[PDB]
Amino acid sequence: KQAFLILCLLSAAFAPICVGIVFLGFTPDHHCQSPGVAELSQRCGWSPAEELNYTVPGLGPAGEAFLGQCRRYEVDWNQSALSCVDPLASLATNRSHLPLGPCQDGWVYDTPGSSIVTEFNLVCADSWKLDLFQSCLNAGFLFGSLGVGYFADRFGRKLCLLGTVLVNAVSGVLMAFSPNYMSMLLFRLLQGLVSKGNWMAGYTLITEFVGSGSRRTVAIMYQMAFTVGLVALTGLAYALPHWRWLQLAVSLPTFLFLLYYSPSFADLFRTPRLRKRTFILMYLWFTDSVLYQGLILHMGATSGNLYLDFLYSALVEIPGAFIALITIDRVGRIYPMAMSNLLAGAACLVMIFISPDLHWLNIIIMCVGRMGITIAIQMICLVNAELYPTFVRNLGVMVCSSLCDIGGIITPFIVFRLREVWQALPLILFAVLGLLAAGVTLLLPE
């Protein structure tokens, strides 16, 4: 089936675009660079962990790593007479009396590889600019969803798809050669504009060519090709430790695909029943998008062994798919989706209380939440279709699914900023959103 495998290749290659930020933008441990410190450390012979104890401001109470990460002692390390046992001890009764300055010379990053964070110095006061890398992508998705389908209706469908695939490949390759952060953000926007349109076009063609007897099965194979793409990403991110190398490796396969070759907006709100259904479907699409992206970003930000945690988290999407497929036939849709929302809400709630050393439990609860949101996302793709009649379904699917893009725009600032107010607070949001999405589902008909 030559035509099937190539669209499954087009579905697999989408996953690195959505989730690759986990590997391209990791933050290692850092502290200010200081002159003379290296020379003194060589003369006195400090070991690598001892140099910190003598040189970098301590954590103190409540962690407060800020004083080590973003400040330095204004001490004349060129002084020859300093004690090789503890050089600061002569200067004041307590190190807290010393003057602090900012990292005027730069940061020292403890990593053998590299990331956009380490190259553009997206730390301390600039640390909010990492959130804009994912927000620009989701904004591009939002504009693409409204524009590209109309362009494909005005222009020829085949030439349109061929053009947007050539533009997606070329923009993905050029981003690896980005000379600065601005250009990288413009390539990330131009890639966002086309990626999701291509993915939806391929899905449309695959379910249109295939008959109604197998549409659900080919849809589930299309979603499983995304999981295969995630496992390939996981393996390449392991063998290629540099971000530009991984961006090239991820981009080049797309060139091989090229080488192989009336409704009206007012209707959705005109009646209170259709309004109710529309607002509920909008809310569930929003909630599930926010939770799916939020849990992956939280795991990337917080896991201590990201490679195996990402591998085990990805594989669990296979039983989730088979369970959804069987449940659709045996049971229904309202109660299975309520239960799968409630399960992810409860897993997010329990994760607040787990002791940080119970990692072997923490991964189990993370996998249970992942499987829950996977089953719920699979269910809503069916429920969203039959609640709208065919006269409006082509529009109504676009309308309700667009909330996924505003959720993706908002999510990065929640995970990265709000965590600095209090580290539990994002999980409290995810718990409340999931436990409200559980109850609201029961108000839909069946």
Numbering used by the authors: 19 to 279, 331 to 515
Copy text from the publication.
Organic Cation Transporter 1 (OCT1), a member of this family primarily localized on the basolateral membrane of hepatocytes, is involved in the uptake of cationic molecules for hepatic metabolism and excretion. Here, we present cryo-EM structures of full-length human OCT1 in the inward-open conformation, both ligand-free and drug-bound, indicating the basis for its broad substrate recognition. The overall architecture of OCT1 in our cryo-EM structures resembles the classical MFS transmembrane arrangement of pseudo-symmetric 6 + 6 transmembrane helical (TM) bundles corresponding to the N-terminal (TMs 1–6) and C-terminal (TMs 7–12) lobes. The structures also show a large extracellular domain (ECD) between TMs 1 and 2 unique to the SLC22 family.
The 6 + 6 TM bundles of our OCT1 cryo-EM structures are arranged in an inward-open conformation with the central substrate cavity accessible to the cytoplasm. Our cryo-EM map of OCT1-apo in the inward-open state defines the entire ECD, whereas this region was only partially resolved in the previous outward-open OCT3 and OCT1CS/OCT2CS structures, suggesting that the inward-open state restricts the flexibility of this domain. The core fold of the ECD is stabilized by three disulfide bonds: C50-C121, just after the anti-parallel beta sheet; C62-C102 towards the periphery of the ECD; and C88-C142 between the ECD and the start of TM2. We also observed additional density that likely corresponded to the first glycan sugars on residues N71, N96, and N112. In inward-open OCT1-apo, the complete closure of the extracellular gate was further stabilized by the union of hydrophobic residues from both lobes, shielding these residues from bulk solvent. Simulations of OCT1-apo revealed that residues V37, I365 and L366, which sit in the center of the hydrophobic gate, were within 3 Å of any solvent molecule for only 8.2%, 23.4% and 23.6% of the combined 1500 ns (n = 3 × 500 ns) of simulation time, respectively, suggesting these residues of the predicted hydrophobic gate were tightly packed, preventing extracellular solvent penetration between the N- and C- bundles. We did also observe weak cryo-EM density in the binding site of OCT1-apo at low thresholds (σ < 9). Although we were unable to determine the identity of this material, we hypothesize this may be a buffer component or an endogenous cationic ligand, or the average of multiple different chemical species, consistent with the well-established ability of OCT1 to bind a variety of ligands. Upon examination of E386 and D474, both residues were engaged in salt-bridge interactions with R439 and K214, respectively, as well as an ordered hydrogen-bonding network with surrounding residues.
